[PDB]
Amino acid sequence: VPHDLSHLVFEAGKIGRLKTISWTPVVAGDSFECDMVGAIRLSPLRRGLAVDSRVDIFSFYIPHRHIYGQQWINFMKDGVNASPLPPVTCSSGWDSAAYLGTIPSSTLKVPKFLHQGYLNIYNNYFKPPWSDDLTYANPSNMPSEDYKWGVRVANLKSIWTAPLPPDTRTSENMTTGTSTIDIMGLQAAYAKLHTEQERDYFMTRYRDIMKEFGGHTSYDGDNRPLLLMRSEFWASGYDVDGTDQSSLGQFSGRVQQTFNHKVPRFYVPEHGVIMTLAVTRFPPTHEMEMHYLVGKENLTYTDIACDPALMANLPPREVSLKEFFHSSPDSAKFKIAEGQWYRTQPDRVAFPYNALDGFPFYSALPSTDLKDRVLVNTNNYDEIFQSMQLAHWNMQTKFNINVYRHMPTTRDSIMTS
């Protein structure tokens, strides 16, 4: 029978960090549907609105088996006298499970499926794909801010914000004879590099190298949380006009955004949790990014002509944060696709701006390091807001859930009978 598991949510977090806003434990065989409707607000910013932030709300299903593996299987089999499922440990702070959208129990411990569940959802859909998994054991092992506000999500695809995989080959040797090459061996050489290149660029995931075989893999083959629903939108608001002697001609942008998310009814195969997370981000607009062709001094035929034959046939080009940013070290490199500068265009911000707080732009220079300079650098948004004890953004939503089960009943459980 319909079980109304509705509840209110009073949220808040940083800019480019994934954070759990709601979770509902589900049992095997029940149908789950939710209607999440609220408003998203940003902290008051220092001037008028200039650029809308984009918001992504995700609802996933992670069965317990996925989390406890064989331990869970045995638990279900063993039944009533199964050994209790050991929760996970947390860090000394009421805001020490935040990322799990839950208050750490009185003993500072929490469900592993809440932890691993979360871990599994990031390492499978947010973490850059050449990147290493968050193999955190317990929330007491994750960085303070990773578990306060959540781990950093990736910046919105730019030219410099989506470099080619760093382990990307720029050459490939075939050991040849001293005065002869094997015309047939060469052929083969190319076949192998192909298979390698594909794995590097597109199939870094099993489920991915499979799909290109024309097959399919159940979220049960690779233990990946199942993405049930996804909502995306741009949050906006209005400016407030100051009207006293001193702040007459001054404004403060107020971002109030009504949003809604609908998770269509869903059949829960096994017992598990449904995680609903939010992520607020701004387009990667840096105040000092230059057009590659304008930042790289001598222009050769290969750079300026856009000869099809050329672009379509040479290795990825290794560039530095220096051919894209005005002061940046010659030393911080990344691999780009030849002619990439012709498939795109950076946003452009006049110098008059780079000295102004209140603009949701990237002031600072990138981060020499690949990873870090891709997964967004949240902190470079601290200067955009006024005062804030409600982080960068806060949310007030009413999670209207409806679960259809085969439950006892309230009176038949308390009725020894």
Binding site: A154, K157, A162, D200, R205, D208, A337
Partner: peptide
């Protein structure tokens, strides 16, 4: 138009 960004899969 056609794809551009290639990380080695899907990045949200």
């Amino acid at each position: 138009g056609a794809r551009l960004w290639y990380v080695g899969g899907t990045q949200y």
